[PDB]
Design a protein around this ligand. Structure first.
Ligand code: G5U
Ligand code: G4R
Ligand code: SAM
Ligand code: SAM
Ligand code: ZN
Ligand code: ZN
Ligand code: ZN
Ligand code: ZN
Ligand code: ZN
Ligand code: ZN
Ligand code: ZN
Ligand code: ZN
Lengths: 266, 266
């Protein structure tokens, strides 16, 4: 219980920091930001007239909502949680309602843009450094947080010393997000071979497809105190395996030293 | 008699609802515009959003000390303990206000973040006797209270020349000159009328960026405002030299400088 809010009041709820494992102080070699930033011109298309929008006069719960149609359908239920029909392995693009829509700010297609609602905690793990865990039970499909950081080109990523906080934004031109120097609570979520949250690309106040915003949703019910983690992917582990191995301790672990040694012996 | 025609013309985008009533005639709620709570662009403005270009404070307090760089850029911080402008504030020639930003080390609740926190007072869009639609107070507003931001579409000075309707223009006189046009896109401030005895004053504020070409316009009450009193500021003589040949001022004040009487009498 060393810092009551690492977000300095920038989020909807505080995010405290605790360490009950070692003597490492709550980390401060970064700059907490709640929204994405840029350190050089990104030229995001912010033209309000280029936004696809809906004409709904209800709460956008009908199948006629265009923004829902943009995302095949609206995948948020009445409580703002992803339907279990959601393709959790290959998620679609989610187009939330925006400032050009005729609907109200409280419509059913505005989950990610409303911010963090669940209670999270920055805590010291036993073998992974810092991690994030739930201070409450989280039902499946609930929005957790956004991967927030410094928008950079992939040419700039090629000269970055530390690539441990990078999120690729595939789409022509390639961009990505770096949470090394600027980032939010998501920069502390570790890899898990049995993940409980998944990343989804979402569009809100703009629709420039080069800059999708990364939202994390729970892939299953999560108990209190349970660590949150998503699948970092093979690109991360083909690179970092030579310096360290995965410590998630799951019987399904693909990137442990024992797992790597088992299949590279065939 | 007076009918309530809209519960909230902002449709839930502001901190508080802004209702629309009419007890004068049968004009329905205005809908020849798109309500937006924040400024928009229809053509690229190329605002400098580089986070490293942000002058910021290293304050570990609530930014009330004389060492806050952000307050120093406005000579001093002009907000009192409650977020109201000091009475010594230059109401004739307001200085540029630099509120604390995302690069500052302070918390989101520091004393230098009044305008970026949104509308707090209760306003109402109503039908005036002779001035079309207006905005009035539903409470008492002490002197120096932040009222609302003049929100609209950011355009160049050349674009304003080719605009059919120049009744909703606010000029940002910097270097390169730009304007806020609330004709097609605007918020509650687009309904504030001119008063020869004004009770609010515009102040130019910088928040998440510090591009001097694009200051944000904040209305603060220039003195105590009684409940039911209409809100208004001095449009300036550029507006009136253009409009006085098409219509006259109906503020009905003992001090009117733009009525057909006052104009002809000199
Ligand atoms: C933006 C385009 C892109 O894919 N960038 C990128 N690069 C790397 N690897 C290196 C390559 C060269 N390095 C030096 C020689 C300069 C710099 C970067 C990269 C590596 C990753 O894993 C180590 C990585 O990851 C993917 C996501 C993992 N999680 C996501 C959230 C946090 C980490 C991404 C990488 N991207
Ligand atoms: C430097 C760029 C720039 O600001 N330009 C510009 N242009 C105008 N009209 C042109 C339109 C046509 N054109 C010819 C070439 C036809 C020449 C005149 C303006 C008119 C204004 O009121 C009439 C005005 O009032 C501002 C205050 C008024 N209230 C309204 C609510 C808020 C403030 C400002 C105007 N500013
Ligand atoms: C995005 S950061 C996550 C936060 C990080 N653990 C910290 O303390 O700052 C990713 C880094 O955390 C560590 N990490 C994440 N997942 C891991 C895992 N499953 N096993 C071992 N280390 C992991 C690795 O060092 C990796 O470089
Ligand atoms: C920014 S709009 C204000 C809202 C306007 N009353 C409406 O109904 O939409 C400015 C226009 O309102 C009218 N107006 C504003 N102040 C006025 C005044 N003091 N006397 C007469 N008309 C005024 C003028 O027609 C002017 O072009
Ligand atoms: Zn809709
Ligand atoms: Zn909607
Ligand atoms: Zn919509
Ligand atoms: Zn593992
Ligand atoms: Zn400060
Ligand atoms: Zn501050
Ligand atoms: Zn500051
Ligand atoms: Zn007058």
């Amino acid at each position: 219980i060393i810092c009551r809010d690492v977000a300095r009041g920038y989020e909807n709820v505080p995010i405290p920091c605790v360490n009950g494992v070692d003597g490492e102080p709550c980390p401060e070699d970064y700059k907490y930001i709640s929204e994405n930033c840029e350190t050089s011109t990104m030229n995001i298309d912010r033209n309000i007239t280029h936004l696809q929008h809906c004409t709904c006069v209800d709460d956008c719960s009908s199948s006629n909502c265009l923004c829902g149609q943009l995302s095949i359908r609206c995948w948020y239920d009445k409580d703002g949680r992803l339907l279990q029909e959601f393709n959790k392995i290959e998620p679609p693009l989610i187009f939330e309602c925006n400032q050009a829509c005729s609907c109200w700010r409280n419509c059913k297609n505005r989950v990610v843009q409303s911010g963090i609602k669940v209670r999270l905690q920055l805590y010291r793990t036993a073998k992974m450094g810092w991690g994030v865990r739930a201070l409450q039970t989280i039902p499946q499909g609930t929005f957790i947080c956004e991967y927030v950081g410094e928008l950079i080109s992939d040419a700039e990523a090629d000269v970055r010393e530390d690539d441990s906080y990078l999120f690729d934004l595939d789409n022509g031109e390639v961009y990505c997000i770096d949470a090394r120097y600027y980032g939010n609570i998501s920069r502390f979520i570790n890899h898990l071979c049995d993940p409980n949250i998944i990343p989804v690309r979402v569009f809100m106040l703009h629709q420039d497809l080069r800059f999708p915003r990364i939202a994390f949703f729970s892939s299953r019910d999560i108990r209190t105190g349970e660590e949150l983690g998503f699948d970092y992917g093979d690109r991360f582990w083909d690179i970092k395996s030579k310096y360290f191995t995965c410590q998630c301790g799951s019987e399904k672990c693909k990137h442990s030293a024992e797992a790597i040694a088992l299949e590279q012996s065939r």
